[PDB]
RNA sequence: GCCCGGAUGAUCAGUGGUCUGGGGUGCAGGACCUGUAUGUCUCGACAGAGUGGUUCAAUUCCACCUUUCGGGCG
């Protein structure tokens, strides 16, 4: 009798590796975990006459870290090609080659529907932006300068300078509330320096409010005229239908050549991981080939046990839910600005982000705005970030005016809020009903 | 009752933060577990009271993901610094700090007792070298060089050209049957180019026989009075208490700017991670700081379950082992070889890797040598390296002649085995009851 | 620093105060944090620890002490189940604790008055033999037990190997429901004689046809002829109607002890049990009656359970039984009115309802034998088919019309459930399975 | 490819041909994809499944469903704890494999001529009982059970919730060792009558100065009054010399059932009980005679245990726990020495050892009362200390000298054991700490 | 479970990711398991589903035409 009982895992496991695409459903965990055993095993580190004389055997002294990464130790690729299948580790390579393909399916549904290729790469998305930077540089050995319409984030201001190059950065125009890509000067910029000392236009969609995603068609369109690269920064856009629409759009009137997308703000998984894809299966071919040696799997498997766990139902399921709870987060910071003479500022163009406007707090006579931010951190609210007036900074030797607000002069301090995915409504009744509390006590 | 219960692991706890260092025996399982809960809910992620309305919150999707991480989600460090503590994850923070001094203590015990400073980094080795090169632009500008000499070992070498600069391969001198070191071309080298176009020279001590450790002491005196730096690749040789050696005496009578190990090599743990070391306090947070945005936390957990499981005795003893079965393998392959009229080379200055000739196949006329490689493979031998002759082999547009032997005409095919940390003399045994019946089948 | 752990340490404290359900589930960082705790207060599990006995609570596999977290000394001491263990007090508070939560449900489920109860880790067939072991020195002359009958070989067996006689009374047909005897019960003590009679044993939860015992009427008859009342409630905690039946029999008559699943009640694995009863005392001598100590684990799955679930947790689930019940019960409905059958009307049952089969042949078709082996391969668990004129043998006795809890019931039927956990998936697979099943098996 | 996973299967394939132990362990991998792989086999775990029942399976917590590896359904059917569970396929598999893990542990052990066993899951005290309760139905008049004396609550209660009434035979002391009355033994039979008595009850393992009972004098006198006879061999697995005495006593004359714990043998968690014999059909009986369904957790831990310990691994921890068993003996034969106490000469008992304390005042100073107390605050476990003229009381019976097997031991002692699993460690803490213990308590 | 207006126009004769006529309308391993199986972004707008593999994207949307209906006019 101990045929049809693995008969039905057999075939969602089959189902799996001959399609490469999401269950629509999610396993059990009965059948995920009969999978990561039967891969584990494929390893040569867990076979059974096994005897092992190299200096890396996939040894492992403590049990508990074997038990905790099913087993799977010999991490992912060889020395010379982080693509390619591993003899001494069958197992890990499989596992590697679905994972990226079920997030390709992902990016897919997500809405890129044109992706041509990509990859998990075991690092963050700061320094997976690195990792394009440094691919080009070979290919444009002239190249300079990297023109990077401005965001106030350090992970991807530094990832320019790690790579070796100088970032250009563009301001920012005011239109409304809104932040928004500097057309002029980007295509000012690229003639005033010239386009062989462009490495790259470098963009970004996911941001902070009251910044929006960057014009992708017409950036692309720059860059297919100037024959330049355009690298975009998407590094919590997975989750926006509106951002992975203009990526996609992008790529259809114009050029993008890579962009970049973390693994714990899309996936929910810990951190430390991202996603290369691209429209030219062979350019995003090369990015993997420029990755030195091996590399961990952690990453991986945690994309591939939270994808399978979910399906694609379930991706479907968190990213209404998201869209909802953004509308219900903005209209419930739109009741409780209007109380203390304050306001939603209107940024109908970023779709994952929002900002309450603080008029009525003087940072230069009772620091109430620094306080506030203090306030909220001891109420444990999470990601409520404060952002003043006229704060300098200085980010590996390049000064910011202005910092956090991604310009020199917004005419208001102002307080973020985001709908991510995996928010629940008892995040936006906790956050409202703290800043509520917060807010009384700094005007009292 | 309560108490003296929980006063006998806190006092092994409040020891390990006070003073850093391993406890000398393993912890209980019981201890380690009550520790890495105290900390896993000092996470942000982990409050009970908790609302985030951020984009990275640390939010976990599927339960098996969460468990096996110990409910560690945020990573390691800042975006603008990867060693600053982390406000949403103080316990994240915590870990890497006792980690990094568990790792600094190890590197201490194992030879290296002036190490100034360290850091866990969650890419491997190649790509931490690329860290390295990258953190050196910035300090020399005009450089364009890196003299390496020779090892056919894909990762280390591409980690050069990932960074963007160009290997000068300086060839080993033949001393014996061992590959050694050619200083003279090396001076010469920095010479003929100039000190300010090197960017460092980037030597190795743990490798296959026959080659052995370079000569470090006089590398640095070099690199110390040519004013340049100096960048030893460490692989797996924390296990060496000879590699360990050199890399001190090279500090003392000259100049090391930062070493570099793997952990899976040295500390049996999942491959993806590795550490930078150097002497120089302040050149080592440099280079720390020239990552970009968070990391991975986990090479740095699976460290520090090792370490407190282990404890420093458990590692003195692993090292002792390593050192036993090294001479037993040596004593077996000289016996196995002697029947087949083979040799193991005279490598008396590599400690870790040894080398059986293979005179007696033909590979033009049978094709024994790469024969003897794939059977090898199918008994189930792993890390059997085998090396035929005039292999040509271009990797990353330079083109080795008789890659894989470090040299361009090495006198004969040979077999490497190594005797690495975690050995069991099943594993030797195995190795020669199937490397014995393998040579037999070629020859009839 | 730690200003953190304190919310974690209020949870806690707060159970070990009052003992009773947390009305929201606890999050597993703060279960686990409290389970870690609890096993190093016991002896083994100390570090500075040496082992000169017998009993010293060494694990040999890694993998069987982490599942168990690290509780290995089972709960009791040899001569008291109830007494807390010097080596092990985490295992001893832990035992305390599962009994104070499972109380506190008990309460919740709808008997208000219950006044002890113990966790014992064996399942409900060989609990109700602990009673009955209990009872008989107190009633040294009792060789009976009267006992309205049921065709369950648990129950059935569990007076004879506690050494007594069964004696079966039969059901009246009372509608399509099957019910208690109450004349020819308290004919049979008569007859008897109420000093021969160990105990009267009735029982709650039950498959359709069959109906929960008139508890009240058993209990007044037990009362007045002074004869203990053991109450079989193996699945009944799910059922405020059975609870409520069970308290009110208490109220006005006697009842000793009830007895209760845990698997079956509480979705935990198989093994479990609990005693519950009205009278402090006694309760307590059917918790000294047992010899040796205990697995734990039984106490330590209800204790993850509940404190995972919570009263709310509790309550929801309970909740949609109800739902459940009516939904499957609508469905039945309406399916057996295209197969020219109907469901049975047993109003008095609130768990288990029955389905007729007349238009199937059993006799000629063998058609009634064949559903419930066509059910089984497409994978209905549950749904148990009950044929007529079966004859069975269980330990010396045979009954005529097993399963159907009388020896000549009008027709044959099909009984389906709605037990606490159901899924809407559960009832409309179940529909659709049993569609195709008639369908094909007339042809 | 999957050239790989054949080796892992023909270790599985290989366990269900034969059935026996493996002589090296199961690595980890190859264990759990063995459990996980019968798991699915349950109908709980299948996945096109509704349940319409109400034992289906249903686990409300993933903490609880993922420690017991799947496993719900407990062993047996409601009418049989030894038939094969339809509803799941897997636990059934799991529970006969665990069974003949343990027969050929049982013969590995000592006594090879073992014809059938089961693993129970109620410690050795309850399952003592269900003997017991077994044998009432084939000599009904019997009410008596001949009991050699040894003070431990949980053996002796066990004849009392069976609900016999046990005849105390007193030992015979004979030299430092307290030994079978065998005449009394005898007298008492004959004052009573074969046929009032239910069985004898000997015991095997035991506190020094008691050793095991002459089991084949008592096998003789069983065979010819045509008595049953019933070992309590609750922690004589590890020991050669008590196997081999059951085999001898069952070879010369009768020896009906030997009951054996799982936690004290095996080292796994407290809970479950191994009954065997060398009549195929009253060991079958024994099981026929448990109602309801049991727990799987006791099995489940045993088969983990023994699958990674294999043979070789088995015989290394009995090798080991000879060894320890002389150095403790060395030890505490020097450290007696040194305070004029000395080791009771008890050769017949191969796992508990005994020193003197007749140097400590009890009724002067209370010092053997207070050297318990000190013993376990520096954290001694298994040190039982014995004082002089203790009256207890268990259930209704009570004993004088309790804990010493008799009335008037000559003096005052101190136990310790080599039970399996101890080190070096063990013996050379309790050293230390019982020399820091006396000399302090010498103030 | 005029396993084997309106099979799955030529792989029920639900729907954007050059997958022609569970008539008419608006087997194997003017139980009338006109495996209109021939969503030579914001009005061997963006995507041979008749004229996965051998508009960026259309099921052998618009106009593993032909046909047809309805309205185990006359
Ligand atoms: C998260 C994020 C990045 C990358 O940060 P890492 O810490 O490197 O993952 C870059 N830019 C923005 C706007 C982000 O939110
Ligand atoms: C392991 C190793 C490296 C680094 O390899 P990664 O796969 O990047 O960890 C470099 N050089 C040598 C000689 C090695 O053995
Ligand atoms: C350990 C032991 C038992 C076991 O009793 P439990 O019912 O398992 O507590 C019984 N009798 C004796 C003599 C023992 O040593
Ligand atoms: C479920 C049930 C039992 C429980 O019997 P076990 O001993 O747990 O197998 C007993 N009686 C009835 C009527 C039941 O429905």
């Given at each position: 009798?101990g ?24 396993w ?41 990464h099913?087993?799977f ?11 390619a ?5 069958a ?41 394009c ?5 070979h290919?444009?050995?002239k ?9 106030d ?28 890509t500097?057309?002029?000067a ?14 790259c ?10 910044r ?5 068609e017409?950036?692309?369109v ?39 997308q973390?693994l ?21 071919q090369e ?29 479907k399921k968190?990213?209404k839910e998201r ?8 209209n ?13 500022l ?10 309450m406007?603080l ?5 230069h006579r ?12 001891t ?17 590996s030797?390049?000064?910011?005016r202005?910092?956090?607000s ?9 307080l973020?809020?985001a ?11 906790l956050?409202?009903?703290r ?8 005007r009292?």
């Amino acid at each position: 009798q101990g045929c049809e009982a693995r008969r039905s895992h057999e075939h969602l496991i089959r189902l799996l590796l001959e399609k490469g695409k999401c269950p629509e459903n999610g396993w059990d965990e009965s059948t995920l975990e009969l999978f990561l055993h039967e891969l584990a095993i494929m390893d040569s580190n867990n076979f059974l006459g096994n005897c092992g004389v190299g200096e890396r055997e996939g040894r492992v002294a403590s049990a508990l870290v074997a038990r905790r990464h099913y087993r799977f130790i010999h991490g992912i690729g060889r020395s010379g090609d982080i693509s390619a299948v591993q003899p001494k580790a069958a197992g890990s390579s499989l596992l590697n080659k679905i994972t990226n393909s079920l997030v390709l399916d992902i990016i897919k549904l997500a809405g890129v529907h044109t992706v041509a290729n990509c990859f998990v790469v075991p690092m963050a998305t700061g320094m997976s932006l690195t990792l394009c930077f440094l691919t080009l540089r070979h290919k444009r050995p002239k190249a300079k300068y990297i023109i990077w319409p401005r965001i106030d984030q350090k992970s991807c201001f530094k990832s320019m300078i790690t790579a070796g190059f100088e970032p250009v950065v563009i301001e920012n125009v005011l239109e409304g509330d809104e932040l928004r890509t500097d057309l002029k000067a980007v295509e000012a910029k690229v003639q005033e320096l010239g386009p062989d000392c462009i490495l790259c236009i470098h963009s970004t969609t996911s941001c902070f409010a009251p910044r929006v995603p960057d014009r992708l068609e017409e950036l692309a369109v720059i860059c297919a005229n100037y024959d330049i690269p355009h690298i975009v920064n998407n590094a919590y856009g997975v989750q926006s239908s509106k951002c992975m629409h203009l990526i996609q759009q992008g790529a259809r009137v114009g050029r993008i050549d890579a962009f970049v997308q973390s693994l714990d703000k899309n996936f929910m998984v810990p951190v430390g991981g991202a996603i290369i894809a691209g429209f030219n299966d062979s350019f995003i071919q090369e990015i993997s080939k420029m990755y030195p040696g091996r590399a961990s799997a952690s990453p991986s498997l945690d994309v591939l046990i939270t994808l399978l766990s979910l399906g694609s139902n379930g991706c479907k399921k968190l990213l209404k839910e998201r869209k909802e709870m953004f509308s219900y987060l903005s209209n419930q910071i739109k009741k409780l600005s209007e109380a203390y003479n304050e306001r939603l500022l209107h940024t109908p163009h970023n779709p994952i982000s929002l900002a309450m406007t603080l008029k009525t707090l003087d940072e230069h006579r009772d620091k109430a705005v620094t306080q506030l931010g203090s306030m909220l951190f001891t109420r444990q609210v999470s990601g409520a970030r404060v952002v003043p007036l006229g704060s300098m900074q200085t980010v590996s030797g390049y000064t910011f005016r202005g910092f956090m607000s991604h310009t020199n002069n917004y005419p208001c301090a102002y307080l973020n809020a985001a709908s991510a995915i995996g928010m629940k409504m008892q995040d936006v009744d906790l956050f409202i009903k703290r800043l509520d509390r917060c807010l009384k006590a700094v005007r009292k």
